[PDB]
Design an enzyme around this catalytic site. Sequence first.
Site, mmCIF file in Angstrom:
data_model
loop_
_atom_site.group_PDB
_atom_site.id
_atom_site.type_symbol
_atom_site.label_atom_id
_atom_site.label_comp_id
_atom_site.label_asym_id
_atom_site.label_seq_id
_atom_site.Cartn_x
_atom_site.Cartn_y
_atom_site.Cartn_z
ATOM 1 N N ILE D 83 33.480 8.376 -17.094
ATOM 2 C CA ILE D 83 32.446 8.395 -16.068
ATOM 3 C C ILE D 83 31.123 8.032 -16.723
ATOM 4 C CG2 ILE D 83 31.412 9.706 -14.194
ATOM 5 C CD1 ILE D 83 33.763 11.615 -14.346
ATOM 6 N N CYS D 84 30.424 7.061 -16.141
ATOM 7 C CA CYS D 84 29.125 6.626 -16.647
ATOM 8 C C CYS D 84 28.065 7.551 -16.067
ATOM 9 C CB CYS D 84 28.864 5.169 -16.287
ATOM 10 S SG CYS D 84 28.476 4.128 -17.704
#
Lengths: 75, 76, 985, 147
Positions: D83-84
Amino acid sequence: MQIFVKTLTGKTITLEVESSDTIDNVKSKIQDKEGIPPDQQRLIFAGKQLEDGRTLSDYNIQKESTLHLVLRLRG
Amino acid sequence: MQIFVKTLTGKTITLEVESSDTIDNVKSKIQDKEGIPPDQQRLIFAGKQLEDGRTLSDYNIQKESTLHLVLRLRGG
Amino acid sequence: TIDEGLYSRQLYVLGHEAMKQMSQSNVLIIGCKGLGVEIAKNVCLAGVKSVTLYDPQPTRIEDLSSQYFLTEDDIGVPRAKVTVSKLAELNQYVPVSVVDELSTEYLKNFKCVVVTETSLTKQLEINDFTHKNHIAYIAADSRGLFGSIFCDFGENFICTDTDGNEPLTGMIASITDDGVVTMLEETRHGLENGDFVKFTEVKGMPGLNDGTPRKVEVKGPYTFSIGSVKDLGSAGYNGVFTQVKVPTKISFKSLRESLKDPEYVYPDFGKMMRPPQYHIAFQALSAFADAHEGSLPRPRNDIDAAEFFEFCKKIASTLQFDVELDEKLIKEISYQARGDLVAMSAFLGGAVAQEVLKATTSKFYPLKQYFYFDSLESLPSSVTISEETCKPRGCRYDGQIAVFGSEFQEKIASLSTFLVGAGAIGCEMLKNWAMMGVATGESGHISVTDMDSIEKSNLNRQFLFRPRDVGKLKSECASTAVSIMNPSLTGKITSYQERVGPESEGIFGDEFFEKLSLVTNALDNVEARMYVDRRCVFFEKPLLESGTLGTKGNTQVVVPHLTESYGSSQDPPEKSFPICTLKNFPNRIEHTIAWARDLFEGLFKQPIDNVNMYLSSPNFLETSLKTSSNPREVLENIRDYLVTEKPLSFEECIMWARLQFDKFFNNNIQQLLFNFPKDSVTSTGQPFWSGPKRAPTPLSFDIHNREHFDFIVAAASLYAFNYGLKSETDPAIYERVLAGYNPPPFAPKSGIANKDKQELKSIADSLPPPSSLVGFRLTPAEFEKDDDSNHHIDFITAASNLRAMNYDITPADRFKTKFVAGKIVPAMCTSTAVVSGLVCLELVKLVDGKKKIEEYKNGFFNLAIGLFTFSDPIASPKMKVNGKEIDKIWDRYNLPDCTLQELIDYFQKEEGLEVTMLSSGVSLLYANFQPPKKLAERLPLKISELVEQITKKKLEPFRKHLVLEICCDDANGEDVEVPFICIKL
Amino acid sequence: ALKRINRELADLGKDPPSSSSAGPVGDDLFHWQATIMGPADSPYAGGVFFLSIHFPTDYPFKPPKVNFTTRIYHPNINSNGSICLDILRDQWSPALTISKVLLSISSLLTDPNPDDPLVPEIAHVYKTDRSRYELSAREWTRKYAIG
Ligand SMILES: Nc1ncnc2c1ncn2[C@@H]1O[C@H](COP(=O)(O)OP(=O)(O)OP(=O)(O)O)[C@@H](O)[C@H]1O
Ligand SMILES: [Mg+2]
Ligand SMILES: [Mg+2]
């Protein structure tokens, strides 16, 4: 008219607004009801982020439209 | 009141404070000027490490005083 | 031509030019006692051109108090003659010589002159010559718990670097017409007023890109000013700025001139009135010695102290010093005149050696000019210190008995210490313990543990190890060396090759720890420090922590029931870049180096591990198909590395390397530019490839280019190593093979049910059966930075530089690539000596059992700027539990191995608290919200049984206690913190 | 770390997150399995996404490792579930609770950010052909997030 604002926790807030009302007024109402500072409000409608200085009619917001209130994160 | 903070790397910082300010306010100012979180700051004045919850007057820190901002090192 | 295989860690502190200047400088050292030998050792390890010794005085027994190159068989021989042979072994590039006599005109051969154990008249005579001939002069002195340093580098000393920091650089966002430079969003320039900067890649203001430095006027953490740029343009966009460091001119005064009006360096701001006292005291010492045939005041002698104070009064009157003399402090200086402590010698030797390096390299800011230091808080108060106890006994400990006494010597001789780590600080600590006489008594003992082995780069600052010792265990070599230094330690040292951690609690258990007196850390990572700190807190043992980084260092002391532990404070963490920045949009060489390391792991480490695990575990495929986050990747790796792309010669390895070059430097960039064209814009109309995002360009393979060929060579060699083939380095074969390569066509793809599982099954059954391959394995590549023949750093450098060429980033060389990828910590011998000295000065406080918290000092220093600072330890926090005073750190509950129900009832009845959570290790033994059935099952079990059941692992036979964390609520429902529980099994 | 983790768990238990439910795996306090509900007015409506959370030994002084376990078609979530999120890599502070992370992830699901993407191809599809992105997201959430 009336509109609905959905938060990240599933809550729905009903607001009495007019198509000519500015985005700033809506953010002010959201701050008055929930206490969330406008600077941290990210309002989304139909996949487009509402920008200050415009009106609801600019986004073709009509009777009983639904908006999303989200946090400001970029990265 | 104006005080100076010297880092272990040689940098100098000037802070505008008052004798009644708590150490937390000083640490917040140092964070603003340097970006170091208050919980990671080690301040030394006259051989005493400043602790949160107390005031500057508790340490007799007056105008033109020099504090040292230090940190621990992991090599060796 | 610097041997980077030996000076690897020191070059990251000094640099190539500094060491080149060092290798052409001669150092003369007058005096070969503990301070002199320490200075000479540090200088020899540093790498100066040569060292010359002058000390014709015959050896005496007391000299062994801090001279570790002297033995009891050398009595009656000049110290220099017996020290030169042992000093010549430290470094093979540094000759060491001896001169039987000194003439003034002979001093012109040396770049630096260091003077110790010399009278003031001789120092004046030497300095009157060195000053007018522009020769650096350093004079050091160590009297008991007092020390002094004096530096004089000439009237026109030029200092090129004044703080040792890397030049500051940053990315600009906009430059107005009035020179107001603004940084990118939430980015700090970090400059100070008066700095100079130069700009590059500035669009709209090309004039700023010439390279002329400009003054900086800081206006805030995010903006600064450079002046008026009206002519150069109206406004500038984007670009980068780099700091320019300018030389400084430092002017020193001679010793004769500076005696009257000295300039002080203050090692502690808590006592700023003392250095003026020591200035008079040391001159009075010199006068007293001159008036008594060079004899110093006898230890703790009142007549000599009175005469010394009369000399001090006379000197103060003569110099018109308007300072009121503190009689107690001056007489203390008199009493310890004949003291000779190895800790003070190490501290001052580190400082003076750093000053010598400053003189020879013209780097870092030197002391200007007097540095007076004292550690008078280390003087014991639990024993009798008088003329009777401090008189010499004709032993090697006279120099220490003259300060501490014989009773304190008995206290020291019966210590039982535990030293964790045997690196630079470990070697220094062992040397200090051997000289001090630690653990030489009947009940004394030393234990040292370290699981590493000696390497070539370690010899630069670990003086107990020689080149013949490379490949052996550090602890054994250190123990043997110190047993040679002090023969009384034969049989009093035990060496382990165990890592201190959770897996070694069977060796360093309750019995081992119950007998210790103190623990000293000499580690290089924070995890081990935290573990040892927790163990010391549980067992209530004093702990001595110390750390170094380049020229910086710190030392801390943890005292049971008095101070806080090591883990009560937080240090800044390591910086990890966002995954998106590394994956697609790098803008710094660090990003490309991280990407190259990940590429190395993904090409030469992970697929090999998958293949090997497939050929060993009989049920690997089924577990992987639902355990890993991408079973398709695992299957593809196994297929490619077993059948599809298995090389049969080195030519196929070269072809594979060429294919990987295309994959990672030409095709992914084309795909990225297909997704986000260079003319694309964001959702707000701004250009996409602006600011932190740099537009890349595909690379076309050219054999003549150096970086492309380096990458091909390294990749082919590492692939051959993986498959065990015979690699080659002749360019002829590479140029011949790569000539006949036809690149497969590539076109970026625009994209546009349950059959995937069927495809996965078909691929899985297509793999050769494990039975067909028995005894066949592929060798994975384990990253190793210190070997310059395994192609690891070569591959990482080539890949990083190629990816930098993709994004137009400035490439780095093997030196910086090895520094960044290897996580190398810069190290110096001088900082190690200083930290060891401070730690051993705190050790005597620990031995005396001092109770007040104002008597201990945590120390910090930076030798590049000459900064020293000390501060009292932080007292452990207190709390109120059931109306009782409890120490948050050092207090615990001691309970038998009762049942969970009985424990809860005890906490309810005794402390009036309700238990809500109870955990042990990494398991949740009990929680208030668990279902009633689970609790009713778990309530009547003993704590040991409950832990065994929940963790599904029986307690080891050596386990004698359990540590439990408990969270409980009061009657009103307010959460109250409580100390941990120690269950006795 | 144990006490901080238990305090967070108890706080979650007291006031329900409504749109999320995180708890330890088995009895291990350093390995949680959280659940996120797809927003109704989004392509992921009617979908349940499972996340794995790994608390480090240094918690709360190092960020928890959060990875999606369900396949999701998002410009900022790749095939490995990474997840960014800024608060998970370098903006983490010892003052953020797991509930805040779950709220951040739900907000991320409710509106992607294609200007700084982690999956350039999905970001390109989102920026150019929006309807195709909507169809693909609905197909993926029906194929993986339901069942
Ligand atoms: N957990 C541990 N238990 C015991 N010894 C340890 C532990 N961790 C590190 N050490 C030892 O502590 C010493 C650290 O000192 P130092 O960093 O100077 O050595 P090094 O890591 O071998 O060298 P370099 O960092 O220069 O490559 C080494 O002997 C290392 O083996
Ligand atoms: Mg090593
Ligand atoms: Mg190391």
